[PDB]
Design an enzyme around this catalytic site. Structure first.
Site, PDB file in Angstrom:
ATOM      1  N   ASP A 138     -51.917 -38.368  31.774  1.00 33.25           N
ATOM      2  CA  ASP A 138     -51.886 -38.871  30.411  1.00 33.25           C
ATOM      3  C   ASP A 138     -52.210 -37.736  29.450  1.00 33.25           C
ATOM      4  OD1 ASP A 138     -52.314 -40.108  27.920  1.00 33.25           O
ATOM      5  OD2 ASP A 138     -53.485 -41.766  28.777  1.00 33.25           O
ATOM      6  N   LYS A 181     -62.045 -43.475  17.662  1.00 36.33           N
ATOM      7  CA  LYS A 181     -62.179 -43.701  19.098  1.00 36.33           C
ATOM      8  C   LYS A 181     -63.181 -42.726  19.728  1.00 36.33           C
ATOM      9  CE  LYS A 181     -59.239 -44.530  23.188  1.00 36.33           C
ATOM     10  NZ  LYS A 181     -57.829 -44.694  23.609  1.00 36.33           N
ATOM     11  N   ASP A 228     -52.517 -50.967  22.827  1.00 40.14           N
ATOM     12  CA  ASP A 228     -53.073 -49.654  23.115  1.00 40.14           C
ATOM     13  C   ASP A 228     -53.740 -49.128  21.852  1.00 40.14           C
ATOM     14  OD1 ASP A 228     -53.574 -46.927  23.641  1.00 40.14           O
ATOM     15  OD2 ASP A 228     -51.455 -46.390  23.655  1.00 40.14           O
ATOM     16  N   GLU A 253     -56.840 -47.866  30.564  1.00 42.10           N
ATOM     17  CA  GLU A 253     -55.525 -47.341  30.200  1.00 42.10           C
ATOM     18  C   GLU A 253     -54.665 -46.982  31.418  1.00 42.10           C
ATOM     19  OE1 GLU A 253     -57.322 -45.820  25.966  1.00 42.10           O
ATOM     20  OE2 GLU A 253     -56.614 -44.280  27.377  1.00 42.10           O
TER      21      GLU A 253
HETATM   22  N1  LIG Z   1     -40.938 -36.914  21.790  1.00 43.32           N
HETATM   23  C1  LIG Z   1     -42.144 -36.303  21.719  1.00 43.32           C
HETATM   24  N2  LIG Z   1     -42.300 -35.019  22.119  1.00 43.32           N
HETATM   25  C2  LIG Z   1     -43.487 -34.377  22.056  1.00 43.32           C
HETATM   26  N3  LIG Z   1     -44.610 -34.976  21.612  1.00 43.32           N
HETATM   27  C3  LIG Z   1     -44.582 -36.266  21.195  1.00 43.32           C
HETATM   28  C4  LIG Z   1     -43.333 -37.026  21.230  1.00 43.32           C
HETATM   29  N4  LIG Z   1     -43.615 -38.266  20.757  1.00 43.32           N
HETATM   30  C5  LIG Z   1     -44.936 -38.300  20.454  1.00 43.32           C
HETATM   31  N5  LIG Z   1     -45.503 -37.101  20.716  1.00 43.32           N
HETATM   32  C6  LIG Z   1     -46.909 -36.706  20.538  1.00 43.32           C
HETATM   33  O1  LIG Z   1     -47.752 -37.555  21.319  1.00 43.32           O
HETATM   34  C7  LIG Z   1     -49.055 -37.553  20.718  1.00 43.32           C
HETATM   35  C8  LIG Z   1     -49.538 -38.986  20.592  1.00 43.32           C
HETATM   36  O2  LIG Z   1     -49.496 -39.560  21.896  1.00 43.32           O
HETATM   37  P1  LIG Z   1     -49.637 -41.139  22.103  1.00 43.32           P
HETATM   38  O3  LIG Z   1     -49.515 -41.439  23.581  1.00 43.32           O
HETATM   39  O4  LIG Z   1     -48.722 -41.852  21.133  1.00 43.32           O
HETATM   40  O5  LIG Z   1     -51.105 -41.565  21.543  1.00 43.32           O
HETATM   41  P2  LIG Z   1     -52.645 -41.383  22.055  1.00 43.32           P
HETATM   42  O6  LIG Z   1     -52.744 -40.180  22.965  1.00 43.32           O
HETATM   43  O7  LIG Z   1     -53.360 -41.236  20.742  1.00 43.32           O
HETATM   44  O8  LIG Z   1     -52.970 -42.683  22.764  1.00 43.32           O
HETATM   45  C9  LIG Z   1     -48.913 -36.829  19.389  1.00 43.32           C
HETATM   46  O9  LIG Z   1     -49.451 -35.519  19.587  1.00 43.32           O
HETATM   47  C10 LIG Z   1     -47.420 -36.828  19.104  1.00 43.32           C
HETATM   48  O10 LIG Z   1     -46.929 -35.785  18.238  1.00 43.32           O
END
Ligand SMILES: Nc1ncnc2c1ncn2[C@@H]1O[C@H](COP(=O)(O)OP(=O)(O)O)[C@@H](O)[C@H]1O
Ligand SMILES: [Cl-]
Length: 379
Positions: A196, A68, A7, A172
């Protein structure tokens, strides 16, 4: 010789591998199951991932992120022109293609978005190879459903630059559905909604799956709504708190603000599991420590409008797909922000009490599915 699933995320990337009949999401050297999509350039080093994000406050002009958002776009793209205004790093024009321009080892250098993303992919590749104990050469990489041919091409090129044979570029939301085995269904259309809410973007996708065949029925969302905006609501709250307590405004000290932002992201994550979180920053401003706390309820209040705003794109997607709520067979949570209890409540309530698929860490579901698909394509 396993293939890996990656990812390549806007804000965080994730890598998994299918072996011994199961997916293993792979932790990096710091033990983190996802890795910031950050690349930094200094007088002496190129840093990627955690190491890059960890010095972003120190080195804003030469720490690159959000590649991205640039990848596969022309320089004159309204999206590029718009996003440029809010990044601390320079974007320049090379033949109507954007390049990020930085200082590296004392010299001015510029990189294509697919070069920056290749560095992130190399890191993810290396994370997997550390775990597997051998070199990896095949991978599936994911992209948003709305990515066009140029964006897909540039993402594949990033993979090839990283030394990967890109088996396939897949969407995705398709990857998330595969993670939950939804591709295994037989003849007969099933309707799947992928919700998402990630780090920088919000994507609603409605898929139909019929005998393992995927179709995109509708997409909706907001490309500038994500976890970082929740972080930002906390930052503004604490800037005001620091002002009242110490009669000092820290808002124009970029270092202080960035460091506060980092601490807010940490507290936010903790509030997904606990009803309160403590923030303690040493020497936030003029040597003043900032030790305080935040409740889950207060956090929810600070973000209430942003959380609620995620439902209208669900409504819009349903309209476009010509489906009622009751016609959705499965609801799948993707993106780190869907781990926020209030966000889950909102979506569940909107769907009148329906189960949410959330047993796979939502920030890992895309990589999980990509890893499954990679294994299928290898045989
Ligand atoms: N347990 C959690 N609770 C709330 N927010 C979270 C948690 N774990 C990750 N995040 C948030 O998720 C976001 C990243 O999401 P992610 O799905 O890893 O990546 P992307 O959207 O870049 O593909 C960040 O804003 C991060 O702080
Ligand atoms: Cl492909």
């Amino acid at each position: 010789a396993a293939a890996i699933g990656i990812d390549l995320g806007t804000t965080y990337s994730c890598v998994g591998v299918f072996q011994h009949g199961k997916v293993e999401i792979i932790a990096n050297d710091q033990g983190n199951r996802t890795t910031p999509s950050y690349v930094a350039f200094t007088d002496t080093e190129r840093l990627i991932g955690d190491a890059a994000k960890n010095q972003v406050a120190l080195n804003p002009q030469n720490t690159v992120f959000d590649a991205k958002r640039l990848i596969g776009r022309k320089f004159g793209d309204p999206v590029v022109q718009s996003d440029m205004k809010h990044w601390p790093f320079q974007v320049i024009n090379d033949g109507d293609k954007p390049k990020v321009q930085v200082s590296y080892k004392g010299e001015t250098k510029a990189f294509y978005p697919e070069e920056i993303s290749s560095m992130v992919l190399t890191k993810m590749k290396e994370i997997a190879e550390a775990y597997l104990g051998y070199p990896v050469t095949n991978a599936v990489i994911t992209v948003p459903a709305y990515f066009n041919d140029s964006q897909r091409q540039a993402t594949k090129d990033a993979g090839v630059i990283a030394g990967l044979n890109v088996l396939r570029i897949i969407n995705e939301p398709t990857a998330a559905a595969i993670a939950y085995g939804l591709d295994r269904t037989g003849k007969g259309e099933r309707n799947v909604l992928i919700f998402d809410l990630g780090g920088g973007t919000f994507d609603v996708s409605i898929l139909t799956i019929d005998d393992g065949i995927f179709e995109v029925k509708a997409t909706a969302g907001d490309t500038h709504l994500g976890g970082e905006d929740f972080d930002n609501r906390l930052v503004n709250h604490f800037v005001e708190e620091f002002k009242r307590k110490h009669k000092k405004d820290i808002s124009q000290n970029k270092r202080a603000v960035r460091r506060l932002r980092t601490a807010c992201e940490r507290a936010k994550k903790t509030l997904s599991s606990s009803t309160q979180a403590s923030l303690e920053i040493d020497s936030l401003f003029e040597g003043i420590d900032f030790y305080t706390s935040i409740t889950r309820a207060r956090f929810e209040e600070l973000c209430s409008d942003l959380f609620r705003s995620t439902l209208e794109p669900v409504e819009k997607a349903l309209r476009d797909a010509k489906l009622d709520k009751a016609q959705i067979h499965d609801l799948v949570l993707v993106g780190g922000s869907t781990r926020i209890p209030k966000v889950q409540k909102l979506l569940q309530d909107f769907f009148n009490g329906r189960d949410l698929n959330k047993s796979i860490n939502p920030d890992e579901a895309v990589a999980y599915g990509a890893a499954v698909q990679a294994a299928i394509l290898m045989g």
